[PDB]
Amino acid sequence: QASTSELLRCLGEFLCRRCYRLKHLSPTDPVLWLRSVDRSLLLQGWQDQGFITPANVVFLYMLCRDVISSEVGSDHELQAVLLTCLYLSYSYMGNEISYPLKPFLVESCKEAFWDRCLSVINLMSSKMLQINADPHYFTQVFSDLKNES
Amino acid sequence: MQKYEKLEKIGEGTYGTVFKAKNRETHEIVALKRVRLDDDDEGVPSSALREICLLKELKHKNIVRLHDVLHSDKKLTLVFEFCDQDLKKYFDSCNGDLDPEIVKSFLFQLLKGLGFCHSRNVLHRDLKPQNLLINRNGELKLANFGLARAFGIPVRCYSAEVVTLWYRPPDVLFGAKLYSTSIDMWSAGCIFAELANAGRPLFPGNDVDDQLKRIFRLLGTPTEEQWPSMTKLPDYKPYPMYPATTSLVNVVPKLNATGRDLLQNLLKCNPVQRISAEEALQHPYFSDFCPP
Ligand SMILES: CC[C@H](CO)Nc1nc(NCc2ccccc2)c2ncn(C(C)C)c2n1
């Protein structure tokens, strides 16, 4: 359970449990949305290597567990929120200096995406640093993600 | 914004435009960094969001202060404290001739800001004079965190394409994929040398090979005993052995023996051997000084 595929499944299973209103969501749906972005960035030459690693999935989960409401009303909304969290993980943890917006944007309203970005940073900036600076916090988050299966 | 009156354009940053502005309600002078969100230059918001995330957590007198972030139109405006000049311009204003006490003050303040970043698990990775802001007070502030990152989480590698060439350490020039706080310590040594001379870069190489040669020609070529993992680095190649007997006296004429010793401690080729910011501040070069 330290494989990337296993942890992504754990995240997908967590999202299905969190978002109880989404009756037709598959735990593979988030996995598919994340892999697609990472693959598209590789193929289009934005990165040399894939971003989705075990530690980056732990990071993304840490954002999702605090950001994503149980009251999300659609699968589309979940995707928009999750992809916001993913784009902030790319910007914070990624090895390239810039990532483009296009693969992450699924909404027609661009300004709602940037507003959600700032709202997430306001909530999470401290924890984003802490999970780097505090190895026991990282281990605790990684353990929680595992226990989501 | 609408809360702020634009007074003039300071310049372009790594990802946006920088203005001097006035807060229309408190009358305070600030600096605005404006970032366009409807790009044809596609990745720019990414570095800005990173800067916002880090600077929210880095509140120190020797790190440029982010006050607010506004989202108003198709733009993100970051509101910072205003500083009068950068060190690069300061060098032009004083004909590259700093008094020794200002040399000490600037290094001290740089090391305090850098020590604070390192202790909070942040690497700056773009330490150079233009990223150092100076006040008429004589206060120095580390700015421009767009290339910076948090560190500590398990990672395969970091980018070796960091730091402007002239300020990049030998290990990163040899393609090291993992580095620590040592990366910024080398760059601070490079700045120290500019301060303590005539404000010109110590190692102005034209490419990676030239850069490594410049460094080794002055400092001497490290041996396997001084640096056992040097030959195992991804872009290692054999260099000539230049002697470690070359004097630093004429390279940094504003520095005494104590000053030259601190410089050599920052400019160790083996990153493990480089002095930390915390230890540099305890160096006898700063023992009789002002702030504490
Ligand atoms: C854009 C060029 C200049 C590079 O140092 N950037 C700069 N320069 C600043 N001030 C120095 C300066 C003022 C006027 C002209 C030239 C340089 C400054 N003050 C706050 N900030 C940021 C952190 C928003 C500042 N940024």
Residues 6 or more apart from A110 whose CB is under 8 A from it? B37, B38
CATH number at residue B68: 3.30.200.20
Sheet holding B132-134, edge to edge: B85-86, B132-134, B140-142
Q: Give the residue from B27, B55, B84 where a domain finishes.
A: B84
CATH number at residue B243: 1.10.510.10
In A, which residues are within 8 Å of B53 by CB distance? 88, 91-92, 121, 125, 128-129
Residues 6 or more apart from A38 whose CB is under 8 A from it? A50, A51, A52
* Residue A75 DSSP class: H
Does residue B94 sit within a domain?
yes
Does residue B37 sit within a domain?
yes
- DSSP-based helix, strand, coil % in chain A, nearest 5: 70, 0, 30
Q: Count of CB contacts below 8 A, A vs B?
A: 103
The closest residue, in CA terms, to atom 3 on ligand 1 is: B11
Q: Which two tokens stand for residue B242?
A: 């230049």
Number of domains in chain B: 2
Please identify, by atom number, the ligand 1 atom nearest to the C-alpha of residue B83: 19
B10 SS3 class: strand
Please, after which residues is chain B broken with C–N above 2.5 Å? none
- Alpha carbon dihedral B252, B258, B264, B266, in 10-degree steps, equals -100
Buried b / exposed e across B253-272, counting CB within 10 Å, b at 16+?
ebbeeebbebbebbbbbbbe
Nearest Cα neighbor of B37 from B45, B29, B27, B46 is: B45
- Phi (first) and psi of residue B215, to 5 degrees: -65, -50
* Residue B290 DSSP class: S
Annotated binding site of B: 10-18, 33
Does residue B58 sit within a domain?
yes
Task: State whether B50 and B97 are in the same domain.
Answer: no
Give Cα A15 distance to the centre of its chain.
Answer: 11
- Phi (first) and psi of residue B124, to 5 degrees: -85, -50
B220 SS3 class: coil
Q: Give the residue from B52, B84, B116 where a domain finishes.
A: B84
Alpha-carbon gap, residue A42 to B3, rounded angstroms: 41
Q: How many CB atoms lie within 10 A of CB A143?
A: 10
- Contact yes or no for A96/A113 (Cβ under 8 A): no
- Contact yes or no for A42/A32 (Cβ under 8 A): no
Sheet holding B17-23, edge to edge: B4-12, B17-23, B29-36, B75-81, B66-71
Alpha-carbon gap, residue B21 to A95, rounded angstroms: 33
The identity of residue B34, as a single letter, is: R
Q: Which two tokens stand for residue B260?
A: 């030259």
Task: State whether B238 and B270 are in the same domain.
Answer: yes
Nearest Cα neighbor of A80 from A59, A55, A54, A101 is: A101
Candidate from B43, B53, B120 with C-beta closest to A128: B53
Alpha-carbon gap, residue B214 to B200, rounded angstroms: 14
Q: Which two tokens stand for residue B4?
A: 């702020």
What ranges in B3-123 are assigned the alpha helix state H? 44-55, 87-93, 100-119
Q: DSSP readout, A16-61? A: HHH-TT-TT--THHHHHHHHHHHHHHHHTTS-SS-S--HHHHHHHH
Resolution in angstroms comes to 2.2
Task: State whether B69 and B161 are in the same domain.
Answer: no
Ligand 1, residues at Cβ distance < 6 Å: B 10-13, 18, 31, 33, 64, 80, 82-83, 85-86, 89, 130, 133, 143
Q: Which residue in chain A is spatially nearest to B70 when comparing CA positions?
A: A118
- Contact yes or no for B116/B154 (Cβ under 8 A): no
> What is Dmax (Cα atoms) for chain A?
40
Does residue B238 sit within a domain?
yes
Please give the angle made by the CA atoms of B1, B5 and B8, to the nearest 5 degrees.
Answer: 110
Does residue B203 sit within a domain?
yes
Q: Where are the domains of chain A?
A: 1-149
B140 SS3 class: strand
Alpha-carbon gap, residue B238 to A72, rounded angstroms: 59
Does residue B292 sit within a domain?
no
* Residue B45 DSSP class: H
**What distances in angstroms separate CA A11 from CA A49, A94, A124, A141, B144, one per listed residue?**
22, 19, 18, 12, 34
Q: Work out the minimum CA distance from B108 to partner chain A, whole angstroms.
A: 25
Pairing of strands B85-86, B132-134: antiparallel
The identity of residue B16, as a single letter, is: G
Q: Which two tokens stand for residue A84?
A: 């916001």
Beta-bridge partners for B149: B123
- Contact yes or no for B246/B254 (Cβ under 8 A): no
Alpha-carbon gap, residue A71 to A132, rounded angstroms: 30
Q: CB distance from A45 to chain B under 8 Å?
A: no
Alpha-carbon gap, residue B104 to B164, rounded angstroms: 24
The enclosing H or E element of B59 equals none
- State the catalytic residue, choosing from B68, B73, B126, B288: B126
In A, which residues are within 8 Å of B151 by CB distance? 132
The closest residue, in CA terms, to atom 20 on ligand 1 is: B82
Candidate from A102, A117, A138 with C-beta closest to B153: A138
Task: State whether B26 and B160 are in the same domain.
Answer: no
Q: Give the residue from B62, B84, B106 where a domain finishes.
A: B84
**Based on C-alpha coordinates, what's the Rg of chain A?**
14
Alpha-carbon gap, residue B231 to B141, rounded angstroms: 37
Nearest Cα neighbor of B110 from B52, B154, B62, B56 is: B62
Handedness of CA A18, A20, A21, A23 (dihedral sign): positive
Task: State whether B259 and B162 are in the same domain.
Answer: yes
The rounded Å distance from CA B53 to ligand 1 centre is: 20
**What distances in angstroms separate CA A8 from CA A20, A49, A68, B9, B142, one per listed residue?**
19, 18, 16, 46, 38
> What is Dmax (Cα atoms) for chain B?
63
Beta-bridge partners for B79: B32, B68
The closest residue, in CA terms, to atom 26 on ligand 1 is: B18
Beta-bridge partners for B75: B36
Buried b / exposed e across B135-171, counting CB within 10 Å, b at 16+?
eeeeebbbbbbbbbbbbbbebeebebebbbebbbbbb
In A, which residues are within 8 Å of B149 by CB distance? 92-93
Task: State whether B125 and B243 are in the same domain.
Answer: yes
- Contact yes or no for B130/B154 (Cβ under 8 A): no
Range of the domain at B33: 1-84
Task: State whether B123 and B248 are in the same domain.
Answer: yes
Alpha-carbon gap, residue B156 to A55, rounded angstroms: 10
Nearest Cα neighbor of B114 from B102, B123, B101 is: B123
- Phi (first) and psi of residue B10, to 5 degrees: -80, -40
The enclosing H or E element of B34 equals strand B29-36
Task: State whether B185 and B165 are in the same domain.
Answer: yes
Annotated binding site of B for ATP: 10-18, 33
- Contact yes or no for A122/B137 (Cβ under 8 A): no
A1-149 is a CATH 1.10.472.10 domain? yes
Q: Work out the minimum CA distance from A21 to partner chain B, whole angstroms.
A: 31
Q: Which two tokens stand for residue B213?
A: 């040669």
Beta-bridge partners for B4: B23
Pairing of strands B132-134, B122-123: unpaired
The rounded Å distance from CA B85 to ligand 1 centre is: 6
Nearest Cα neighbor of A8 from A79, A61, A48 is: A61
Q: How many CB atoms lie within 10 A of CB B42?
A: 13
- Is B126 a residue of the active site? yes
A13 SS3 class: helix
Q: Work out the minimum CA distance from A18 to partner chain B, whole angstroms.
A: 26
**What distances in angstroms separate CA A58 from CA A97, A128, B88, B273, one per listed residue?**
21, 11, 41, 33
- Residue B88: is it exposed, middle or buried by C-beta count within 10 angstroms (0-12/13-18/19+)? middle
